[PDB]
Amino acid sequence: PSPLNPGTNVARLAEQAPIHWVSVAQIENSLAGRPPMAVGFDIDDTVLFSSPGFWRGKKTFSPESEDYLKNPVFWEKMNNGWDEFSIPKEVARQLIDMHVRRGDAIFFVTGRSPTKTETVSKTLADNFHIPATNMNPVIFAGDKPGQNTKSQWLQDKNIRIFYGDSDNDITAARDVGARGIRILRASNSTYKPLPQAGAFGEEVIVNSEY
Amino acid sequence: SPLNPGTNVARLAEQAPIHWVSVAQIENSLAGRPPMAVGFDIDDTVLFSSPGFWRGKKTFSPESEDYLKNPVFWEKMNNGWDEFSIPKEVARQLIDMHVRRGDAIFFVTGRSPTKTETVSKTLADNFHIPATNMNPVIFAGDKPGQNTKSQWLQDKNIRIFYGDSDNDITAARDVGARGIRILRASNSTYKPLPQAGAFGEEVIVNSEY
Amino acid sequence: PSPLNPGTNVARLAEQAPIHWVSVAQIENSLAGRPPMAVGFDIDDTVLFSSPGFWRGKKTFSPESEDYLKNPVFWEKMNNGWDEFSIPKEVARQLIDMHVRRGDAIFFVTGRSPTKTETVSKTLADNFHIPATNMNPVIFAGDKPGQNTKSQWLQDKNIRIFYGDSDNDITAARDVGARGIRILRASNSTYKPLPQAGAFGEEVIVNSEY
Amino acid sequence: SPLNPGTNVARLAEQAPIHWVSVAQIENSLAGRPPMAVGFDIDDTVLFSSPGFWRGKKTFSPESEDYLKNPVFWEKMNNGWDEFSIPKEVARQLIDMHVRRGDAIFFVTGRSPTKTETVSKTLADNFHIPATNMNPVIFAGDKPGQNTKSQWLQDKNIRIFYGDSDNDITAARDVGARGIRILRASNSTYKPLPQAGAFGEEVIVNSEY
Ligand SMILES: Nc1ncnc2c1ncn2[C@@H]1O[C@@H](CO)[C@H](O)[C@@H]1O
Ligand SMILES: Nc1ncnc2c1ncn2[C@@H]1O[C@@H](CO)[C@H](O)[C@@H]1O
Ligand SMILES: Nc1ncnc2c1ncn2[C@@H]1O[C@@H](CO)[C@H](O)[C@@H]1O
Ligand SMILES: Nc1ncnc2c1ncn2[C@@H]1O[C@@H](CO)[C@H](O)[C@@H]1O
Ligand SMILES: [Mg+2]
C-alpha cells in the first residue's frame, strides 16, 4: 500500500473534520449556575490508560486468543492491583477537579467483569484526589445475573453527564437523555480499532488522549 | 488561557520544518547496502514502558525523581515490570525491516545495569528477533552532563540509531551515525516531550504508537 | 456408633499409644553442639492453621465436590492474602524461635498449587519474626511441569530435619535420610481424616495441635 | 520447666470432676418434651471465628484487645469475615437435633451490634436451619462487670443455652435455664481457655471441633 512519496497539499494540511470540540473550561462554563448534580465516567481509556494490564493479561491468559477478557483470574489481577501500572489521564484530572469544584457526585461505571474485591475505587480516589463526599464506589455494570446495565445505572443515579471513549458510552448517555461527552482513546491503547470520536455529533474534549 | 481561544487557517496549516520520513523511505534509502549494525533505544522508542516507571515513582520516590538512581527500582524494572510495557508498532516495523535486511540489532538504553535482566528476552520475544540478529541489551545508564550512549555506538559499529530523546540523536551525531527520531507518546510519564527534529534529524511519521 | 452411656474403666483411662513424644526443648538438646544446618517446615497444619481459607474456598467454589483444590481463582486468593485469616501455630513459633537460636537456615516447602505471585513468604516472615538471614522464599514443590518434588527439594537444600503433619511429610524426610518430625493436625482442621501421628515410629511433638 | 518432666499413672488416669454429656444424652433427656426455645452462643460454640478476630487484631490493635471495642472492626466481622469462620461439628449435631424436635433456635452473641449484619444469614445457611426455626441473631455486646446475655435469655424464654464461656453458663444460671458448655478449641485466639465445668454444668464431650 502507500506510495513511497505520497506528498500532500495545503487543502489537506488545513482540513478539519466537522466535530464539536470542547475544553474543560468550556464545559464548566456551560454548567455555570447549575447546582450540584451526579456525573459519571467510564474508566478504561477515559480516566485510566489501563492497556498495560490488559496487554499483560492478553499475553498471560490467552496469548493465541481473546479469551482473557472472560477469564476470572485475569479479572482478579486487573481489579486488585494491576491498575498500579495504569497511567491516569490528565483530561480526567481536569474533569474530576472541575466536578469537585462544582460539588458534583462522581460515579465510575465500568464494563469490566466484577470481582468480590476490587482496589480500583481506592486507586481512583487516591490518584485523582477525590474527596469522600464526591467519591462513590466503582459500579460494575453489564448484562450478567445480578447486574444492571450502564444505561440503567445512569438512570438510577440520575447521572446528567457521562464521559467516555467508546461509542457505547455515548449511546448509553443518549439512551437515557444524559449529555454524553467523548474522550479520545490514546493511539497506543491496545483496545483497537480506535472509535470515531464525534460520530454522534457529541462534544469531544480537546487533547484528551493523555 | 482564553475560554474561546479560537484559531485561524495559517495556524491550521502550519508545519514545523521537520524532515519527516516513513519506514518505507528509510528502507529505500538502504537499498543495496549490505548488512550492518543498527541500534535502538528502548524506552519510548520500542516500548511504552511508563507503566513500570510510573509504578516505580509511586513506590520508591513519590515526592522526587530519586527512583531513577535507585538500584532497588532498577532491579524491578529490569526483571519483570516490562511485562506491562507495550511494544510500539513503529518498532515492530523497523525491527522487521532491519532483520529482513540481515542487520544486527542492538538495544542501547539509558537504564542502569542490574545483576540480572530479562529485558533482552522480552524484546527478542515480543519483536520476533531471530537469535542471529539479536544482541543482549546494553545498559548504558544515565549521568548528568554526558552522553553515555556514544561509546557503545562506536563499540558495536552502529550505523543507524533510533531513539526518542535528544541524547539518542546526539549520540549518533557524536560518532557520525545516522540518528533517526521516534516520537515519544503524549501519555508517557517522561515529560516534557522532546522536540523531535531539534537537530535537523529525520523523524519517523506516526511513531508515537 | 455408641451406647447412650458407654462407661469406661481405668485401664482405658490410663491407656497410652506407644509414640515417641518430644518437646521443643528436647529437640534443641538433641542438636546441642551441632553447627548451623538447613531445616524445613510444611506450611498447612504445621505452621499455619489455614483451614479458614480452605473452608471458604470449598464453600465458594465446590460445596458438593473437591474441585476447589483445582480452581485457579481459589489458589490466587489463597496464596495472595487469605492467609491473613490463617492462625499461626504456637508450636511453630517455638520451633522457629529455636532454629533461629541455633542459627539454622529455615525453609518452607508446600504442596499448594503454585501461582505467579505469592504473599505467603511475607506472612510467614512477619508472623514468626524470622530474620532475613534465616528466611528463604517458600518452595512450591510438586509434580506440575517445571516443579521438583518435596523430596528432591529436601536433598537440594540439604535439609536435615523436616517438620510436618501429613504422612507424606514424614516419608519425604525418610526418603532422603532426613529426620522427619510430626506436628499434630488440629481436630478442627477441614483436612480430614486426621493422620496417624507416630505411625512411622517418628518423633511427635507434644501439644502441637495449636 | 524440666527438660524431662516425666509422668506417672495417677496423672495419666486423672479425671477432672466434670459432668460430661453427649448430644445423644441431651436428646434423650428431652424426649417427649414439647417444642421450646433454645439458644447458642456463636463464637467458639457454633463457629470457629478466630480467623476474623485475629485479622481484626492485626488490623485495628496489634498491641492490645482494643479492637474488641472498635465499631470499624465490628462492621467487618459482622458483614463478611465469617466466610472464614469454620462451623463446629458439635453445633451441626445440636442444631440438627433441636430442629428435629421443632425447637426455636436463637443465637445470643457477645459481639457488638452493627448497622447491618449478615451473621444470621451465614448461620442459617451453614447449619441448614429452616426459616421457621431460625431467629435473627441477638448482638448482646460485652460490658465489664455485666452479664449482657442473662436478660436476653429471659426475654426469649430460652430453656437451654449452649456456650463456651463462663458468661454463657452463668447467664443460664441467672434465669433458671439449663446451661451446657462446649469446649473452646485450643487454637482459638481467645485465651486463656475457659475452665469448662467451673459451675458444675454439663459439658459436651469432644465439642472442640
Ligand atoms: N480494555 C479492553 N476492553 C475490551 N477489549 C480490549 C481491551 N484491551 C484490548 N482489547 C481487545 O483485544 C484486541 C483483539 O484484537 C483488540 O485490539 C481489543 O482491543
Ligand atoms: N520520567 C522519566 N524520567 C527519566 N527517565 C525515564 C522516565 N520514564 C522512563 N524513563 C527511562 O529511564 C531512563 C533511564 O536512563 C531513560 O531516560 C528512559 O527514558
Ligand atoms: N482442606 C484441605 N483438603 C485437602 N488438602 C488441603 C486442605 N488444606 C490444606 N491442604 C493441603 O495444602 C496444600 C499443600 O499441600 C495441598 O493442596 C493440600 O491439599
Ligand atoms: N478471639 C476473640 N477474642 C475476644 N472476643 C471474641 C473472640 N472471638 C469471638 N469473640 C466474641 O467477641 C467478644 C465480644 O465481647 C466476646 O468475648 C466473644 O467471645
Ligand atoms: Mg473506555
Ligand SMILES: [Mg+2]
Ligand atoms: Mg527513550
Ligand SMILES: [Mg+2]
Ligand atoms: Mg500440612
Ligand SMILES: [Mg+2]
Ligand atoms: Mg463464645
